[PDB]
């Protein structure tokens, strides 16, 4: 079938590539409104930090290379401006010529993702981060203005990564956030080490703080404070890229996202939606879920490829919401329902704090593992881990446990890989099980 | 009930402690033939390397302290020499006085473990490593003789750990092994990094090599080579400590181990066996399994405690054989049936080598993950991982998968925790699933 994809990055380029694996005959075209396809979204903070020097690392493909290797046509600087779903075409604006045309499809795959929110100030020193163009712009501005003092707005995991990278690059960031709910996917009390790490490096932060006014480099804050900053990076949330979809028959939710079934189909025949734009449900509980992360974009890309060109009995089973961020010396990982969603269950909490590995083995550090379970059926609802070592390992194991609706009690049976550098004969995970009675 | 335990270490002392958690009234006595109870078996190589220098990490308790804390009586230098099961007593030799006596029991728990094999040479410079007495003897010999050149015999995980530790201590070890089958718990073609790490540090080794003759410090080898060594550490396997059991009605297998049911019961009423001495079955396949490692000793200890003084519905579900060793910069981990046992199945192998984390992200290292599955039911039979980073994480996740009867194909559904320092949007585990078929 003739395949049209909207968006040429984590969901879109991946999905097109996965289709080509199964189908070498069908014509596949991707439209991308911006300059670059297949940029490494998750690499961008590290590019800013000069942790990733080789820009070859930030871009996986050019349209020419993508066609040479995969025979997939990608048109950059081409923005889909409408979906004419009944005639099965899309309206495309060629941004270089400002001329529009229609492209027909047999199957349409929407992976337009999300755009950065802006505070809306009239300021030449303020930047958001979403693609490689933005990264280039930030880097250029730092060099052109010899930026030192930088205001980082927002305490979400990406903004935190940006802050760390600015610090390591040698700049002097200050963090502000409009509330005290930093790194919001993690349990609030377990986020303390973020503040500790800031304090340790004398990186200033202010929570429940906001920009009031901007006058050149002079920033006035809600608190009444006035500070001079060379640059501002705003990480104040994102919004779905769905304005071009509203005139079509596709059903959007009140927030502008696209609900999909387990085949990643929209309500309209022959149109799929994947990635950040799509909403689904949890795997382990009967609740809606939105998990705008890379794993889900890649998984959906594969499922849609099977739907279109492979085994059409392959369907999504829902999200667990596994997520993770590194901040300086610490790892913060969680999986399952969000903190605010626990209230929809009758639940209990079990936790342990123990060395990541054998206490006598050097380089040890305390790992805090927390598990919530449903009192009606003993099933694990949520797990969270914070520490310098071992948090990703425990949370990945628990993700696998939840995938199978494992109970908290059965954690006593988990057979860990033990040698002194790695764990304990009764691992932290085992101890959760022993302590659950 | 009056409880007698044989062996006061990983299985025995742990089990006694777990019983006391549940039962404060029963008399509990442990007989230990050697000097120390509760020594840290797994720490011993690191004590030798002077990595672990605090004595308090080398053993947890003296009998006096154990009694003060838990009211459990432990008699060291007391060797059980016979089990008189028809009269419900054991015969015990007080090794200090050289007098024997009978001790009655209502329940008997056997955790005698295994002893190190010896090459049988008459050599004052040769040592084996099994307990803290051995560790002290090795340390003292090194200092008393200004040991520099050490011959390490055997290439199993214990020997490898001892070699690394002798090197870090500043000594000069040479490794020999009778064959090329080093680190046998790992796939034979995945062990090359062991040899690479030896070469990189110019630590000599010879495979297909054996001690032929010893004359003082002059060692003559199978290869015909003649070398002088200050010390020899022999790691040439272990044998079950079961000779004292043979005259009793307890059923032993032909290799000298004790088969037990899922309650860790022997064939004889009121007698349990746990730890290295015990044989059971795999959890995921219908085959016999023996896994002489700490996790199993500890899990069996808990189950036996529940059987005697707690919830007797709690039963073992079998072994997976999860195991791991560090050697210099590398980790070698595996789980499931042994390579030699794969032939009992119709199976296929799938593998991937990929960076442990995001390719553009620094400090990366290639991680090799291999998975064997049963073609009859797509179930996972064995997994193995080798790399500087991430191998323990992948194998623990796969251990949890096998616990849950996951098919290889369902690995595509594993929701990993992804950010650049930790993994990929399609993790190695996911790629195993995609590559299967
Ligand atoms: C700085 C940063 C760090 C991140 N770090 C992590 C992380 O550590 N872990 C994690 O799991 N996730 C991380 N993410 C999230 C991640 O990148 C997304 O979940 C993923 O990219 C979603 O895939 P997508 O295809 O939905 O959106 P994208 O990858 O953002 O691709 C959407 C594309 O569609 C294009 N587009 C939109 N509308 C149109 C149109 N009308 N016509 C043509 N093209 C259009 C856009 O320009 C864009 O290029 C990070 C994101 C950012 C920005
Ligand atoms: C150097 C070394 C490193 C190791 N590293 C690891 C590792 O990294 N990971 C891992 O999972 N495992 C490791 N192990 C394995 C581990 O220690 C065993 O699996 C565990 O100790 C088994 O517990 P057990 O109670 O069966 O035997 P043990 O812990 O060895 O205790 C058995 C005790 O019974 C006593 N005994 C025997 N017969 C009698 C008798 N007739 N009367 C009285 N007492 C008796 C013995 O003297 C001994 O003290 C290591 C072992 C060694 C020696
Ligand atoms: S923010 C974090 C996530 N963001 C993004 O992913 C950024 C943009 N991503 C993309 O544009 C695509 O994901 C690109 C980079 C184009 C890759 O697309 P694919 O996921 O489809 O992978 P490739 O085709 O480039 O192949 C790479 C290696 O993986 C193997 N492989 C992919 N898919 C499969 C399946 N379904 N089954 C078996 N193997 C598969 C490839 O064969 C290949 O192996 P190599 O030995 O490296 O060639
Ligand atoms: S070779 C690898 C393993 N090494 C060996 O096992 C060496 C020999 N080990 C032993 O001799 C025993 O294991 C000793 C050290 C004597 C004690 O065994 P336990 O496993 O029972 O540990 P403790 O009794 O000293 O208790 C310590 C902490 O763990 C908590 N805890 C133990 N058991 C449970 C259960 N069943 N349920 C909930 N919690 C449990 C304790 O409460 C305790 O916590 P603290 O921080 O000390 O208050
Ligand atoms: Cl990326
Ligand atoms: Cl239309
Ligand atoms: Cl729907
Ligand atoms: Cl230990
Ligand atoms: Cl008898
Ligand atoms: Cl590969
Ligand atoms: Mg007799
Ligand atoms: Mg490769």
Order of adjacent strands in the largest pleated sheet of chain A:
3-2-1-7-19
Task: Describe the main β-sheet of chain A briefly.
Answer: 5 strands, parallel
Q: How many beta-strand runs of chain A? A: 26
Protein chain pair with the most extensive contact, residues per chain: A-B, 64 and 62 residues
Terminal residue distance of chain A: 56 Å
Shape annotation of chain A:
globular
Q: Could you tell me the CATH topology label of the largest domain in chain A.
A: FAD/NAD(P)-binding domain
Q: Identify the quaternary structure here.
A: homodimer
PDB class: oxidoreductase
Keywords: oxidoreductase
Assembly: dimeric
Entry title: Crystal structure of the Y419F mutant of Staphylococcus aureus CoADR
Give structural notes.
Chains A, B: InterPro entries: CoA_disulphide_reductase, CoA_disulphide_reductase_staph, FAD-bd_OxRdtase, FAD/NAD-bd_sf, FAD/NAD-binding_dom, FAD/NAD-linked_Rdtase_dimer_sf, Pyr_nucl-diS_OxRdtase_dimer. 2 copies of one chain form a homodimer. Chain A has 437 residues and is α/β, with parallel strands linked by helices. Chain A has 9 helices and 26 strands. Chain A has 3 domains: 1-33 and 60-113 and 240-322, FAD/NAD(P)-binding domain; 41-58 and 114-238, 3-Layer(bba) Sandwich (FAD/NAD(P)-binding domain); 330-437, Enolase-like, domain 1. Chains A and B meet through helix 7, strand 22, strand 23 and helix 8 of A and helix 8, strand 22, strand 23 and helix 9 of B. One coenzyme A (COA) sits between chains B (9-10, 13-14, 17-18, 21, 38, 40-42, 60-61, 294, 302) and A (425, 434-435).
